[PDB]
Amino acid sequence: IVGGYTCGANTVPYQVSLNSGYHFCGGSLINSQWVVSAAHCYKSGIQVRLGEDNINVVEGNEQFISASKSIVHPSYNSNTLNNDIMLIKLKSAASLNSRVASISLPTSCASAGTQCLISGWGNTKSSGTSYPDVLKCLKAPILSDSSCKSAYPGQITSNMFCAGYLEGGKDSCQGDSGGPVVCSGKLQGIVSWGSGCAQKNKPGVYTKVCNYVSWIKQTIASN
Numbered sequence: 741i742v743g744g745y746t747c748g749a750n751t752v753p754y755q756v757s758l759n760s761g762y763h764f765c766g767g768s769l770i771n772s773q774w775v776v777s778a779a780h781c782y783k784s785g786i787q788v789r790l791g792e793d794n795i796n797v798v799e800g801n802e803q804f805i806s807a808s809k810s811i812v813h814p815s816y817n818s819n820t821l822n823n824d825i826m827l828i829k830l831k832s833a834a835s836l837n838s839r840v841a842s843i844s845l846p847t848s849c850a851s852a853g854t855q856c857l858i859s860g861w862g863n864t865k866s867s868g869t870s871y872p873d874v875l876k877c878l879k880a881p882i883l884s885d886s887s888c889k890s891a892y893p894g895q896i897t898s899n900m901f902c903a904g905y906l907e908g909g910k911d912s913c914q915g916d917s918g919g920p921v922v923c924s925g926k927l928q929g930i931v932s933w934g935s936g937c938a939q940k941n942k943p944g945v946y947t948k949v950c951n952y953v954s955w956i957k958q959t960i961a962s963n
């Protein structure tokens with residue numbers, strides 16, 4: 741997260757860290773046994789780390805659970821990043837409590853202007869690399885489709901939306917991928933891609949979760 745602030749330990753209880761000997765992507769806990777992340781975060785040997793704040797120190801409240809299976813959307817396209825969404829089933833159910841809780845799926849799509857909270861342990865620098873120990877947060881609005889399409893001509897599909905600041909300076913970045921974009925208590929987006937980080941006229945692009953609620957429910961119900 742570039743230009744954000746320290747969230748504060750366990751203030752984003754649905755935030756998950758995907759780990760394979762190091763943090764590589766974020767995720768959102770949607771129920772005691774399922775996590776939603778980005779398809780481009782797919783990798784074998786995934787350990788889901790819940791209740792984390794400082795990812796480099798065991799401080800208490802952490803739950804490390806192996807993924808029993810990862811389900812990348814069948815229509816995910818690695819070239820266009822269309823349908824960049826993946827479901828991860830935990831080997832065991834997480835212990836839900838004050839510091840580890842699930843986020844609700846939306847019942848309707850969010851409108852332009854809606855303010856949302858984006859979080860993660862990704863790069864905190866626009867020019868260079870600096871990864872934080874603790875979870876960073878950023879409040880950013882959902883941009884209009886016209887502004888989004890004008891920023892990335894021909895690269896925005898109906899399963900994507902832009903959120904952030906055109907003036908640059910505040911944005912999600914590498915390492916934040918797969919993480920949550922929560923608006924009014926509903927998970928509306930998944931950190932997906934962008935051109936650089938926090939660059940002027942190059943806002944972040946996110947997977948439009950509201951287009952996948954039926955798919956998510958049907959898939960979870962059959963696995």
Ligand SMILES: CCOC(=O)CO/N=C(/c1ccccn1)C1(c2ccc3c(c2)nc(CNc2ccc(C(=N)N)cc2)n3C)CC1
Pocket residue numbers: 780819820821895911912913914915916917931932933934935936937938942943944945
């Ligand atoms: C770094 C090398 O990348 C390449 O060579 C190809 O990039 N190809 C594309 C592309 C996207 C959509 C449609 C067509 N082509 C891209 C692209 C595509 C996928 C990407 C990407 C950049 N960067 C990432 C890494 N994560 C990331 C980056 C920036 C973010 C942001 N600004 N909010 C949020 C997350 N991922 C994941 C240049 C914009």
Ligand SMILES: [Ca+2]
Pocket residue numbers: 792793794795796797798799800802
């Ligand atoms: Ca920790």
